């Protein structure tokens, strides 16, 4: 499913080389999120399967149609800083360890909720 592949491109990095602004600015460019600068974007780390599992076993309902993880994840949230959102895109990083909320379709993650 292309929506799942997009989710992984935008929101999955198994073993991050960093958790800092340097990491964010690199990752936002490498994952195609700087044309123009995406304002807020979270990367989830660790095992791919456990993220998928949020759609089923490792997850629970979360209104409206969203789902929250049963376990916490290491994450890195990249937040745009500077001025107007044209490259080169500058980011500040917030490393976290918490439960995440996603939207699922066909038992696959398609959407990451950035409301935290
Ligand atoms: Zn901005």
- List CB contacts of 58: < 8 A, sequence separation 6 or more: 50, 69, 70, 71
| Active-site annotation holder among 11, 38, 52, 67 | 11
User: How far, in Å, is the centroid of ligand 1 from the Cα of 13?
Assistant: 23
Please say whether the beta carbons of 55 and 107 come within 8 A.
Answer: yes
Q: Which CATH class is domain 1-116?
A: alpha beta
71, β-bridge pairs: none
How distant, in Å, are the alpha carbons of 29, 91, 101, 105 from that of 71? 29, 27, 11, 20
- Per the annotation, the verdict on 99 as an active-site residue is no
Does the annotation list 64 as a binding residue? no
- At residue 68, the 3 state secondary structure works out as strand
The HSE-up count of residue 15 (CA atoms within 13 Å, CB side) is: 0
Cα R_g (the chain), whole angstroms:
14
- Per the annotation, the verdict on 111 as an active-site residue is yes
Instruction: List the determination method.
Output: X-ray
Resolution (A): 1.8
d(CA 101, CA 44) in angstroms, rounded, equals 11
Could you tell me which of 43, 22, 25 has the C-alpha nearest to residue 34?
A: 25
d(CA 103, CA 62) in angstroms, rounded, equals 9
d(CA 7, CA 89) in angstroms, rounded, equals 21
User: What backbone torsions phi and psi does residue 93 show, to the nearest 5 degrees?
Assistant: -110, 140
User: How far, in Å, is the centroid of ligand 1 from the Cα of 89?
Assistant: 9
């Amino acid at each position: 499913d292309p929506r799942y592949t997009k989710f992984l491109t935008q929101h999955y990095d198994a073993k991050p080389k960093g958790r800092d602004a340097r990491y964010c600015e690199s990752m936002m460019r490498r994952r195609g999120l700087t044309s123009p600068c995406k304002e807020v974007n979270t990367f989830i780390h660790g095992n791919k399967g456990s993220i998928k599992a949020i759609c089923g076993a490792n997850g629970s309902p979360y209104g409206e149609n969203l789902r929250i993880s049963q376990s916490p994840f290491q994450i890195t949230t990249c937040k745009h800083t500077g001025g107007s959102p044209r490259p080169p895109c500058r980011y500040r990083a917030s490393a976290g360890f918490r439960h995440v909320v996603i939207a699922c379709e066909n038992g696959l993650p398609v959407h990451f909720d950035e409301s935290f």
